[PDB]
């Protein structure tokens, strides 16, 4: 009769709570999930996922995500931004630039380790 | 720095790289899935 | 060279007590607020764990 269901994202829960179908726009081809349904992974596409309950209805919209699907339990790991490869790489290359650096080295520098012993003791005084 | 404890901060280090009866329908593909999902374990690692 | 001046001095480090006291307590309550944002993220990390053990299985 009722399935239990979860919208979750790396930051905060979305939804929770018992459910009567749950349909999702999968990577192939749209989805019905009810109670009981067999073992299922599938990719989502940005749009909204409209959760069925016990008759009152619910929509959310959602950026991307997983899909996971059991008999008894139904869980969407939803994603919090559009992941599309311009974007993706955009990020990565503000790294870059701000990484650069006057004094890059050659990667073997070291023997460090007494500035941070020296300090370590100042702070024990500290306290 | 881990939170041992609201006196604790432990410094810590972990390896990121390198890490039933049923089977899943998989949609389109579990490669496809393999690596996506492997992305969104990192990325989650990381801000945790 | 006299009383002034010392008298100026504990007036100088009573001030700055009173803002470090402040902070403390500043500190206390952002710290509670940084452990729920830690709890809100667990169930993304334990759940995709064990798609992905499966997945591979």
């Known amino acids: 009769i009722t399935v239990h269901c979860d919208i979750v994202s790396a930051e905060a829960e979305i939804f929770s709570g018992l459910v009567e179908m749950v349909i999702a726009h999968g990577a192939l081809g749209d989805l019905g999930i009810a109670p009981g ?31 996971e699907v059991q008999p008894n339990m139904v869980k969407v790991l939803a994603d919090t931004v559009v ?18 650096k006057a004094l890059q080295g050659k990667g073997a520098e070291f023997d460090y380790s007494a500035a941070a012993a020296r300090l370590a003791e100042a702070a024990a005084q500290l306290r | 720095n881990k939170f041992v404890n609201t006196m604790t901060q432990k410094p810590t280090v972990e390896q990121l790289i390198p890490l039933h009866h049923w089977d899943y329908l998989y949609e389109p593909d579990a490669k496809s899935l393999l690596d996506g999902l492997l992305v969104r374990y990192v990325e989650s690692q990381v801000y945790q | 060279a006299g009383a002034k001046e010392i008298r100026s001095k504990i007036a100088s480090i009573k001030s700055t007590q009173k803002i470090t006291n402040a902070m403390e307590k500043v500190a206390v309550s952002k710290m509670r607020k ?4 830690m709890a809100a993220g667990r169930p993304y990390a334990e759940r995709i764990r064990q798609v992905i053990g499966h997945l591979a299985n």
């Not at chain 1, 989502?44 to 619910?58: A, C, D, F, N, S």
């Not at chain 1, 992941?83 to 650069?100: I, N, P, T, V």
Request: net charge negative; proline share 6%; hydrophobic share 40%.
């Open chain 1, 37 to 67: 349904h067999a073992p299922l992974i599938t990719d989502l596409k940005p749009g909204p996922i409209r959760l069925v309950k016990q008759g009152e209805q619910e929509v959310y919209y959602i950026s991307g995500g997983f899909l």
């Open chain 3, 34 to 37: 940084a452990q729920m944002r």
């Open chain 1, 83 to 100: 992941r599309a490869g311009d974007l993706d790489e955009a990020a990565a290359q503000e790294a870059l630039k701000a990484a650069e």
